[PDB]
Structures are given as C-alpha cells and as structure tokens.
Amino acid sequence: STELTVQSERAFQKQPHIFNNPKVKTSKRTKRWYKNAGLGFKTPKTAIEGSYIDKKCPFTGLVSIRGKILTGTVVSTKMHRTIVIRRAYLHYIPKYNRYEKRHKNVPVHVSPAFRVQVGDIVTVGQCRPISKTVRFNVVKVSAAXXXXXXXXXXX
Amino acid sequence: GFPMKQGVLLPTRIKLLLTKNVSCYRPRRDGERKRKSVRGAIVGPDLAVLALVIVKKGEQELEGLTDTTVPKRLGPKRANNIRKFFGLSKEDDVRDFVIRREVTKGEKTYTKAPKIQRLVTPQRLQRKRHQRALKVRNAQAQREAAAEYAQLLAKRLSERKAEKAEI
Amino acid sequence: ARGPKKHLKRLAAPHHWLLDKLSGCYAPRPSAGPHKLRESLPLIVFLRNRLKYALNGREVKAILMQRHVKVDGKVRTDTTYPAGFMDVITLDATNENFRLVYDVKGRFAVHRITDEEASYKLGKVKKVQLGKKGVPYVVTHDGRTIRYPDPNIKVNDTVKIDLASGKITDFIKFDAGKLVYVTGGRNLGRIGTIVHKERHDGGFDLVHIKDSLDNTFVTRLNNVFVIGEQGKPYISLPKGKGIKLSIAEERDRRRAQQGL
Amino acid sequence: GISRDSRHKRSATGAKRAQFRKKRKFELGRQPANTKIGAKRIHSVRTRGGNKKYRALRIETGNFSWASEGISKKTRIAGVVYHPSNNELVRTNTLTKAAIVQIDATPFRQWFEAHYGQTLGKKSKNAERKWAARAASAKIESSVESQFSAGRLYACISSRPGQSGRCDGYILEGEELAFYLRRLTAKK
Amino acid sequence: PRAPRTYSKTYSTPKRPYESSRLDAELKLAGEFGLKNKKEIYRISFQLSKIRRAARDLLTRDEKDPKRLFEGNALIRRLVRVGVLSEDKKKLDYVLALKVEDFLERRLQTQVYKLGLAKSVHHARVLITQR
RNA sequence: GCCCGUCGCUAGUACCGAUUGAAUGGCUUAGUGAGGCCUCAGGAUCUGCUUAGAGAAGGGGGCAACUCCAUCUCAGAGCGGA
RNA sequence: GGACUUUUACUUUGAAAAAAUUAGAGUGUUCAAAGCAGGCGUAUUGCUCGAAUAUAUUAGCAUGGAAUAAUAGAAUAGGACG
RNA sequence: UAUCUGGUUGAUCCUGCCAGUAGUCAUAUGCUUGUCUCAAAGAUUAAGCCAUGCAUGUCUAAGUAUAAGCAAUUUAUACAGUGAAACUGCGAAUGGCUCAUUAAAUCAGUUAUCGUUUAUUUGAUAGUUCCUUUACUACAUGGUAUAACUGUGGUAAUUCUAGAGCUAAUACAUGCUUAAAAUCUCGACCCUUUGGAAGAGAUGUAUUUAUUAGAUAAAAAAUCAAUGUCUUCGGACUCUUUGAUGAUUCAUAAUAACUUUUCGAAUCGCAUGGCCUUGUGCUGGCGAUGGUUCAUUCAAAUUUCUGCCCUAUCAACUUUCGAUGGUAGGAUAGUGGCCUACCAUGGUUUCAACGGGUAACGGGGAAUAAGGGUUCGAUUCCGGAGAGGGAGCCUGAGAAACGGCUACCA
C-alpha cells in the first residue's frame, strides 16, 4: 500500500547494506536491490521502478517464496500492506456423496508493488511467518478491476 | 548438632539456600541446590561445641596438644611439588628425593613409593615430537594436494582453450 | 518429547529387516552414522538374521569384539552399527566379502563378492558444495565427505571410491540412458537405465525408468541411484537384477523347477 | 520465565485458548539487558545447546566504521540522542541497535589528517607523494566536517549489545544523516 | 508392549435357533459322520461360507483378471489337494457350487473308516483319538 | 353397552417455592504476595597485580666499572579479580 | 534460456505412501487358533525356496482426458493482430 | 452374507410401536467346569490415599591409587599385579505408567526452514599462539586447592555434616611453540625522472560491525578520477577465471577493524628400535582420549494445505491487561504481537463465528457382514500430556524433569 512519503517512520527506511556513497556523484541517488522469487513469477516493473522499502516484499525485500503456492478472491483490503483473501472450495461428504460449500480467509502480505482492490483474483506464495497470521505473499494479480470502467455514464 | 557458617552473622539459626562447594552442604546431584538450617557465626550459649585454633604459644605446655606431635600422613607426589618441597632446583634427579613408605608384610619388608606425575619422560617427549611431526606432515600433505587440484584445473583450462580453438 | 529416543519397539523396526513378530519387544536401534535409520541394517541383524552365524545377540557382540568383522575398511565394534546400502562387509575368517544391496523385493540381500570388488564403493553425491579456505567438497550418500573432486561432478552423480583410502575415481554422470538402481519406494530393488527426468521446480523431480524386459515405472530423483550404462553396471548385481516378476510369473518359476 | 509461544494469546478469530501442556524451557525468553554506557561490564548468558551470548550492561567504547572511507576506529561512545522505538532509551542513554550516538571524532581525525594533509574544519617526501597521489577525493561532506568541528560524530548502532556484547555502529551519511539531522534538531 | 498373539474364531452360528428342518439335517450329519458338538457342523459350514464368499467375489471380476488368475487358481489348487473339489469339475464355479458334505467326508475321522480300520465311525473316533 | 370431569384412598416421579437457600468445578477483578531467575548495591575471607625498604640464594661473565630467567619472607603504596 | 499465459470442478493413471490389523499366496504348527517358517543330501565337515501381492477411499503432488458443469472475454471499442 | 416372527379386531387390511430373534476384543454376575495350545488382566468409580521392599547406575592395556588394601613374583628404589573408597568422565531427558486436561488444540495425511538448535555417531578439518624482537620468555613439560584418608567432633533424629592435618588429574586455573611464500601498509636515504628503494609493520581460526567480489540477457564504443602488467616509448593491454538454486544479501572469498579473546594437545596404554656429528643429542611404531569449523546421523523446535463429537433454550464475537497490521528495537537457538515503544483500525461470522457440552487424548484401529451405513477405539504400534495441585528453576547437548531442587495449596 504505502503511497508517498516513503520515508515516513521514526526510523530511517533503508534496504540493508545497499550502500551508496555521497562522495560518488550520482544521477540515481540511491542504489537499489532486487531479485526474482522464482517459480516463473516475473518480478513486476513497479518493484524495480519503485521507491518504497518493504522488507516483506517478495521481489525487493528479505523474504522468500517457498512451499505451497495458492490463489484466491480478494475480500479485504484495509490493513496497510496486507490483505485478506477468501479461498472457496467444496468438501466431499461420502455418506450423502455430495460436496458442500466451504471457504477459508488467508491473511497475506501485499507488497507496495501491486495495486490490489477487493475482487481481484490473486496468486500468493507461502513464505516464513512475517506476522501473527501471515504466511503468504501476493505474487501475481491475475484479475484487474472486474470491468469496473464498463459501468460509467452517458455522453 | 547444626553447624555454624563463616560470614552469616546473627547469634541465631537461619535456613539458607546452599549450593555446590560451600560450607555445610555437599550436593547429591549435578547442580542440586538445597535449603537447610544453619547456625550463625556469632558465638552464643546455644553451642555444644566450639571449633578453635591455636595461633600463638602460651607459657605452659598443653597435654594432647603442644606436647604430642603427629606427622602429615602423605608426602609430595607431583614433580615440582617434590622439588620445591625440598627446594631442589630443576636438575637434582627427582626420582630419588621422593619419600618411600615402609610397610611390613609380616615377615616381608615392603618399600612403596607414590608415582611422580608431571615428570618429563622419554615417552612424553616421544609423543610431543610425534604431534609436531604429524601436524607438519599433514600440513605439507594438504599443501601438495591443493597444488595438484590446482594443476588439475590448470590442464582443465588447457582443454578449454584447446576445444574452444577447435571450432 | 524431552530428548533422544534411545530404544526401538520391535514392531516399529523397518520391515525389510525381516524380524519375526512374536518373541521380542525390542529391536536393534541403528546407531548414528553414515546411513539413515530406516534404510540401514544393524550388524547384529546381518551377522545373525541373515548370516545365521549367531543366535544370541551376546554371541554377536562377542564375535564383533574379536574384530572378525569390518565395514569398508575399519573394524567397527558397534553391535548396532548403522551399516547399509553400497557398503562392504569383510570377513577375514570365512574369507567372505559382502556388499549390502537390495534385491527386487526391496529387502536386503546376502550378496557375496570378490575380494577384488571388495575395495571400491559406489556413492551417490548428496552435495557438491564449496568449503572453507576455498576447498570444494563433494559429500556422497554414506556420510563420506571428500575434498578436491571434479568440476564435472554435480548433485545426484554417483561415484566410485578407493575405500582403502578416500579418493574418487571415475564418476558416472546423471544423463538420459544411464543404468540406474532404485533406492526407495515400491520400485526399489529394481534397475532400469533411465528414460526421462520430469523436472518440476522445487517439487520432487520424477524419474522415468525402463528395465531390461520392456517394463516401465516412474519414481523420484531421491530414490534414484545411478550405476552405469545399459547392461554395463559397475558392481555385482544379484540374481534377478531388478526386473520384478509379477505374482503369477513367480508362481510359475518356483513351480517351474519342480521335479525332485 | 518469559514464554514466547503463541499458545496463549487469542486466535485471529478472537476465541480464547485453553491450556494444553505446560511452559517448556525451549520456548523461554530472558530479560532485556538494557545496556548502559561507561566502564566495560559484560556478563555472559548460557544459551541453548552450549553457546554464549554476552549480555552487556555498561559500555564505553565501540568499534565504529566510516562507510565511505573503508575504515573502522575503536572510539569512546558519548550518549544517545535519538531512538526510533522509545525516548526512554535516549533519556537514559541506553545502548541498543538502531540507536543514534555521538562518538569520539578524534581517531577519525588523526586518521584523516594523516591520509590527506587537508585537516577538517575551517613535509615528508614519501608522505607528500602519497598525498599528491590522493586528494581529488577529500571533499568529505558539509555535515560530516561540521560534525568533526565539535568533536562528536553521529553514528548509528548496528550490533546487538544485549546479544553480542558489541556496541558497533556506523557514522551517518547521505540521506540517512540528513534524516536524522532533520528529525533531531526539529524536536529540540 | 509386545506383539499381539492374534486370533479368530472358526464357527458361525445359526440365525434362527429352533428351525426343526435344519435340526433334522444337522442331526443327520451328526449320526452319519460321528460328530460331537453341533459346532463341528457350524465350523465347517462357516469355513465353507468364507470359501463361497471369496468365490462369488472373484466371479464378479473380469475373467482372466490378475487376482482372479492367481488367487482363483490358487483356491482351486487348495480345494483339490484335500479331496473336496474334483479334478473333473475344477474351475471355481464348482467351488461356488460345492456343499458341506464334501468337507465332512474328508476328515481323518471319516477316511479311517472309508477303507476298513473302523466298521463304525465311532470306532474311527476312538481309535484316532487314542494315539 | 361404551363413557367424561370434580371429589375421596394408597404409591411413585417431576415442577413452583420463603430460605436471595446450600455443594462440587473452571475461569476472574481488587488487595496482599512466597519463591527461584535477571539486576543496582554488599564485601565474613582470600587470593592476587603493580610501587618500593631490611637479610640470603641463582650468574648475562671482567683485573677495578658492569648485568639476565624462574622461586620464597614482612614495617610500607596503587590497580582490579573470586 | 529469453519472453507471456482466463480460473475451476470432474475423471484417469502414477508417485508418495511404518509395521500389527485386514483381504490374501506359499509352508501339513500331526489337526486347528497361530508361527514365518521351512524344504534337501553326501544326516562324519552343505544343498536350497522363502519371508509375496492387495486395500491404503478424503487433501497435497504428478499426469492422460476435454464430454458434463461453472468461469473470464471486444458495445461509450479504453478491442484483435503487424 | 439381501429371511423375520408374536401382541390392537367378532373377524380384516393398514399405520405403528412393543416383545422375541442373532452377534459383540463387551463388561459384569450366576450355576457347572476334565484335557492341549494361545494368556488379556484396578481403564470405567476416586489423574483418590499409600505401609514396606525393589525399580539407575557405570571401568578399558589406555584420566586419578603411597588403602597403613589383598596377594605376590619376576625384576621392576619414581609407578607398573589386582583393587575398596574418593576424584574425574558419561548416564540418569531412554525406559516404563496413567488418559486428567485437551475440540482447530492434539492427532492425521501433506508440507516448509532461503526460519533455527543438536551430546552423539560418521566422513572431513588446524606450520602462524612471544614480541622493539643481540646480552631474551620453563616447554627436558610452569601454579595450587580439595576429596578419599588420618585426626578431634556436634545432634533424639536423614545418603546431616563442623574445626584441623595431608595428596592426585584427560578435575580447577594457566601457558611456550614450526618451513616457504607473496600480498596490504608505513617508509630512511637519491632525484626530479617516466619516477625506485633498502627493511620496518600487519596478515591462523573464532568474535562483532561496515564495505566489497560472488559475473553469465545477444553485441560495440567516447570520456572523467583513480592504476595495474610487458616496453616494439606515438603506446597498446591480446589468452584473461568463475559454484549452487525454481529463488537469496547463499556457499566461498577480500578489505578496515573490533574481542574482560573461541580454538589451535603441559593427556594416557602397549612397545622400545633407527641412524652418527656417541650428545642419555637427534628421530621413530601401532591407537586411546581430547580438540575448533563443515558435513553426516539420532534428533529436536516452530510450520503450509485439508480434515473433528453434540449444541441457537449460544448471533454476534475479538481490542481489560494484543484484538488484526505497519515501523523500530528487545528477547529467542531462531521465525512471529513472542514482548515493548509509536501508529493505524483492524480480525472471525448462518459456507454457523464466539460461547456452552462432552461420563472427548488423537491416529493405526475395533464390533456389526447385500450395499449404503452404524457404533466403538482409556488399552500391546505411532504422536501428544502429566507424574497430588500450581508456579519457579538448577544441571546439562537435550528437562520448565518431578524415583531433580525451590516456594506456595491440599
């Protein structure tokens, strides 16, 4: 999430060790570090172009995408740099031989490299514990805004 | 029967938490502490026995004390402990100056001596020399092996330039 | 649960050991060492349950204490020594030389080898990793760590060792078409030349295999051990060479040799 | 003692949790050293599986690096003036990581004046050779030189004195020095 | 903490207890083969029942199926070896046929009578059980 | 013919109920708060480093000037450790 | 190795899959419940077969299918390719 | 192995229950009980209470024997046989026992550590340790301080122990050492050139910080400040080395440093010779214990995905005194609201949250045989939890242990 300010905390926001020297005259100002999480998840343009800091950012931070890779629908975007997605599914009951509707709300960290809203079907990858309820990180916004501009007005 | 304990003060009895290697408590398990009663270090009337030490001689002899004498049961067993028990200076062959004890085996008279530890012996020097020798030997060993891997990669690069020139 | 599990309840003990259900409440806990617990074979099970050279484990311990056994060189007086796959058991008395290896029933076979063949070992590398002071090292499956190997060697590449000393000789790379011994699964004991390695990034690489009978099976890049070229292994395979006879064919062969 | 499990606490759903099992030693937590300044006193804690941490309480000298000079000098630390977690760690001059101190600014002088012959603020042959060789690389920076004048250099602690027993940090520079400057004089 | 010395029973037991006809038949079997308890009928008919069970289980499988192959002809070898199943009618449809009589008339009890050595099935019993 | 309810007898069960009734169990405020653990101090005693007096030992090797290593003892000054 | 990809349910084969249990093959514990034994000569100096197979259903993985049934797409063209 | 039968009516056909009928690794109780094999067994209620005994100790040629110990004999005047006690080392954290608590916990199948610790075993792994450094520092090996023991003792009373006299170490505490090499620095002098040089300092490993190398997406050029190697003196600069991963700030390496300095052998048993410069000079055999880092193994800890019985006469629940998240620290072996400080207002919910219940440990499993189901699982295998309740903690690789201690309640 973030937006603006970037340096907006009591402690300086700097990526670890990524040093740039004031003696060294520069046009880039601050030297930047990035990578790719693997699993064919193309490290998004806005992650390298970006100006934020997020040490929980999978592409420009100090975490690692590994384990399960899941997808789900976005039901919540309120908490700063973290959202809540709802994976639905059907559970097979043999006695009646029928599948019953069920769901789970996974809390997932979302880097300021994305522009997530409620609805955008999204793809996240498991990581380390980053919080009390966070074990995943958004790694591909599959949807968009669900034909939102399509609902407009007249002329 | 409770014991005193230097540096607890009080002419009373206090229950203290005792640990390893400290008066009035010998532990019974690895790091096993125990809270036991103890008597203060301040002499009172409640005492049955008082442990005293003669520090300066009087003007009269004391029966089972000053008068009679009794020897330290043992003698020096380590090397320099002997040498410096007699003040011999490091040379005077410490394999003689060790006290030997006569015990009589009825109609056999036995002379038993300790066992001088920390003595410099032919076998210990043999060992030390073996240590240095082994260390240096494996040192040069690993150096040469390092050189041989270096040459392996060398005439690996050689086949690199050879095959890359081939095309 | 408070510390190291020092016992072994005889019912938990790996089935390929072949121990009898009744008569006993415990089994030889494999000691720590080169082989994983449930893919090892205690020298007490070997010098007794397979070699019948003993009865009481006490006799086993006595035998071992008289140095009359040695694994890949060193004597080994650990009654429950965790010996296992590709290892070499030497008996100077009896003049017997054994290689611990899988049949096709995925058990452990009483395999006798030459005294000559009993001085080299196959060893799948588990890691080609750089070490301290620059020294590169390969660590093969049997805990063996050998420094200064070959930049042509990568992970899962098998290896022939001097045993007598600790040096790698000719190494067999992991390519399509290399004679492969299966170490784990219910396709273990089998052998079959490699067909094709299903990749799957960070998700257990499947290994497609076809033996010498035109039969095919898959496994994973874990249970797969390389041992040569088609028809051309590097060690002495046992009587069956991992072809896995079906049940009816087994009914046939064991009743094929019928006339007394 | 302090027990860093998650087994207490509420679940994210809000429900209160029962008590399965008792406090386990392997999930312990020990007290914050609350390291102070002055006269080295360091007590070692026996951590898990052998291994020691060196809980430091009172520390007067630390090894501080100058990022754009490739050097590190063991200097005398002189109090905290800023800390992003709490101001108590500043009023108390408590030494923690990420803390901002002012250091001796005299070994860095004696080094810099013996490496450039330029001397902050405001004769040998080989020496002059080396100096002429250098220079064209000694503009320092307004803030670091101004820092030098007073004889106290803003540094930022980077080691963990509770853990390591070390009080190492780095001289501030660039946008970071700028940030802490701003943030510092503004709150006076 | 040991291994369990496992077990099973060897007899099933009639649903209806007082069906006259089956009491007739079972009693006949008793006075024909010199049996003791009505348990030696139940047991045998239960063994047989498990056999028939496996049989009709296989029958549903495709013919020349792996399991039908191996286990079918295995059970066939089985029922032939003792002399319950005929070498003539030797293909598992006849094990689905079968009858308890074929098990009854194969006992050592019975065969020590079938060619003399007895004159009566009871003398067979006694002589067998007496070493 | 069947048959309903009040009323009367015996037995059993459950309910309402003054007692703001009573009992076991789990949580929990407030107050008091043992114990070990960390921590500021403490310093029975008990060694130790550095600055030196008053007697001997052991010699870097000299005709007189000159000078190194380990060890033991007390009237007497600083830097700390258990 | 660079560069991008509408998401599913379903089914298939397979991998991963402790043993005891269970279904079940062989072996006459004299029979049976069991046990995993055992069977052979040269029974005065070994010969030898075994200790199988199956189920292991939901979920995760791997794969073959493309019907059935959902899903997303270009209408203010803010479309498609070049 | 797909079976019904008796009871409502005068009689009938229904609905429907009742009763019969068969099993039960399912308890009990009653009557009778001869033979072989197999042998479960204070779970249910009272994880209620316990007399007494016993259940964890342990020695190799190879850490310590002056027993005033027993025995000798082959020697063995330092010790050498064997060996109580005591030190030291390791173990006592496994095993056994119970099922109380426990319902998204445990457990299960499936995962993750690019999120950590790990005695051991196994395979590797150490030439630097002193210091203005010719009149040198024990390394032919530096310091004591204790038990056992002797001796004087205290208490009604315990595996209670006090004062004194001795003495060991692979215990306690110290502390020398080894070749070459080149690299990074300082540089006395000489001489201005285009510039070089004596010999002085630093460079084991570990520690903590900061910086750097760790290329590789197909191919070329100009310039600035540094500045390397060979002179064919306008200058070129060609051969120029590159690990792993799906993925890293990974392995690995460099510089500048820092440390009440990690480790780098003052250890033990058998043998006892090789070679002369005959010095009690100098080397040397096999294997034991130890010793830092890496791997390995036995492990451990958290961890992803899906799965629980009854309950709405429980509908809202979570933020008190963390509830959901961001930042920073602190703490951990390490991830993390694990904790603190600031900040935000979030998190679960009829697809049933939260709460209550459970005479609920979970699973492998078990009983009942058309099928679908139903019921059960304290209990021999795995995983968890506890040792009357609670908390606290010592020791240690590993315990919040209980045949450990400490405190409180009973």
Curated annotation (Swiss-Prot), chain B:
UniProt function note: Component of the ribosome, a large ribonucleoprotein complex responsible for the synthesis of proteins in the cell. The small ribosomal subunit (SSU) binds messenger RNAs (mRNAs) and translates the encoded message by selecting cognate aminoacyl-transfer RNA (tRNA) molecules. The large subunit (LSU) contains the ribosomal catalytic site termed the peptidyl transferase center (PTC), which catalyzes the formation of peptide bonds, thereby polymerizing the amino acids delivered by tRNAs into a polypeptide chain.
The gene coding this protein: RPS6A
GO biological process: maturation of SSU-rRNA from tricistronic rRNA transcript (SSU-rRNA, 5.8S rRNA, LSU-rRNA); translation
Modified residues (Phosphothreonine): T104
Cysteines paired by S-S bonds: none
GO cellular component: 90S preribosome; cytosol; cytosolic small ribosomal subunit; nucleolus; nucleoplasm; small-subunit processome
Keyword Mitochondrion attached: no
Miscellaneous comment text of the record: Present with 66000 molecules/cell in log phase SD medium. There are 2 genes for eS6 in yeast.
Superkingdom classification of source: Eukaryota
Organism encoding this protein: Saccharomyces cerevisiae (strain ATCC 204508 / S288c)
Residues of the full protein shown: 60 to 226 of 236
UniProt crosslink position (Glycyl lysine isopeptide (Lys-Gly) (interchain with G-Cter in ubiquitin)): K57, K72, K90, K155
Chief location: cytoplasm
Location in the cell: Cytoplasm; Nucleus, Nucleolus
One of the record's GO molecular function terms: structural constituent of ribosome
Keyword line: Cytoplasm, Isopeptide bond, Nucleus, Phosphoprotein, Ribonucleoprotein, Ribosomal protein, Ribosome biogenesis, rRNA processing, Ubl conjugation
Keyword Nucleotide-binding set for record: no
Protein name in UniProt: Small ribosomal subunit protein eS6A
Family label: Belongs to the eukaryotic ribosomal protein eS6 family.
Curated annotation (Swiss-Prot), chain C:
Source superkingdom: Eukaryota
Modified-residue entries (Phosphothreonine), positions: T114
Modified positions (Phosphoserine) in chain numbering: S31, S246
GO process terms (BP): cytoplasmic translation; translation
Keyword field: Cytoplasm, Isopeptide bond, Phosphoprotein, Ribonucleoprotein, Ribosomal protein, RNA-binding, rRNA-binding, Ubl conjugation
InterPro entries, A to Z: KOW, Rib_uL2_dom2, Ribosomal_eS4, Ribosomal_eS4_C, Ribosomal_eS4_central_region, Ribosomal_eS4_central_sf, Ribosomal_eS4_KOW, Ribosomal_eS4_N
Pfam families named in the record: 40S_S4_C, KOW, Ribosomal_S4e, RS4NT, S4
HAMAP family: Ribosomal_eS4
Similarity annotation: Belongs to the eukaryotic ribosomal protein eS4 family.
General remark: Present with 573 molecules/cell in log phase SD medium.
Name of the protein: Small ribosomal subunit protein eS4A
Source organism of this protein record: Saccharomyces cerevisiae (strain ATCC 204508 / S288c)
Protein encoded by which gene: RPS4A
From Swiss-Prot, chain D:
Family according to the record: Belongs to the eukaryotic ribosomal protein eS8 family.
InterPro entries, A to Z: Ribosomal_eS8, Ribosomal_eS8_CS, Ribosomal_protein_eS8_euk, Ribosomal_Se8/biogenesis_NSA2
UniProt cross-references to Gene3D superfamilies, sorted A to Z: 3.10.290.70, Ribosomal protein S8e, subdomain
Lineage: Eukaryota, Fungi, Dikarya, Ascomycota, Saccharomycotina
Organism from which the protein derives: Saccharomyces cerevisiae (strain ATCC 204508 / S288c) (Baker's yeast)
Summary of the function given for this chain in its UniProt record: Component of the ribosome, a large ribonucleoprotein complex responsible for the synthesis of proteins in the cell. The small ribosomal subunit (SSU) binds messenger RNAs (mRNAs) and translates the encoded message by selecting cognate aminoacyl-transfer RNA (tRNA) molecules. The large subunit (LSU) contains the ribosomal catalytic site termed the peptidyl transferase center (PTC), which catalyzes the formation of peptide bonds, thereby polymerizing the amino acids delivered by tRNAs into a polypeptide chain.
In-chain residues carrying the UniProt-annotated modification Phosphoserine: S65, S68, S72, S85, S142, S143, S146, S149
Keyword Cytoplasm: yes
BP terms from Gene Ontology: maturation of SSU-rRNA from tricistronic rRNA transcript (SSU-rRNA, 5.8S rRNA, LSU-rRNA); translation
Name by which UniProt lists this protein: Small ribosomal subunit protein eS8A
Domain of life assignment: Eukaryota
Curated annotation (Swiss-Prot), chain E:
UniProtKB keywords: Cytoplasm, Isopeptide bond, Nucleus, Phosphoprotein, Ribonucleoprotein, Ribosomal protein, Ribosome biogenesis, RNA-binding, rRNA processing, rRNA-binding, Ubl conjugation
Localization (cell): Cytoplasm; Nucleus, Nucleolus
UniProt-listed GO biological process terms: maturation of SSU-rRNA from tricistronic rRNA transcript (SSU-rRNA, 5.8S rRNA, LSU-rRNA); ribosomal small subunit biogenesis; translation
Domain of life per record: Eukaryota
Entry GO terms, CC: 90S preribosome; cytoplasm; cytosol; cytosolic small ribosomal subunit; nucleolus; nucleoplasm; small-subunit processome
Gene Ontology molecular function: rRNA binding; structural constituent of ribosome
Signal peptide: none
Family: Belongs to the universal ribosomal protein uS4 family.
Subunit composition and interactions: Component of the small ribosomal subunit (SSU). Mature yeast ribosomes consist of a small (40S) and a large (60S) subunit. The 40S small subunit contains 1 molecule of ribosomal RNA (18S rRNA) and 33 different proteins (encoded by 57 genes). The large 60S subunit contains 3 rRNA molecules (25S, 5.8S and 5S rRNA) and 46 different proteins (encoded by 81 genes). Interacts with snoRNA U3. uS11 interacts with MPP10. Component of the ribosomal small subunit (SSU) processome composed of at least 40 protein subunits and snoRNA U3.
Additional remark text: Present with 106000 molecules/cell in log phase SD medium.
Protein name: Small ribosomal subunit protein uS4A
Full-length numbering of the shown residues: 2 to 132 of 197
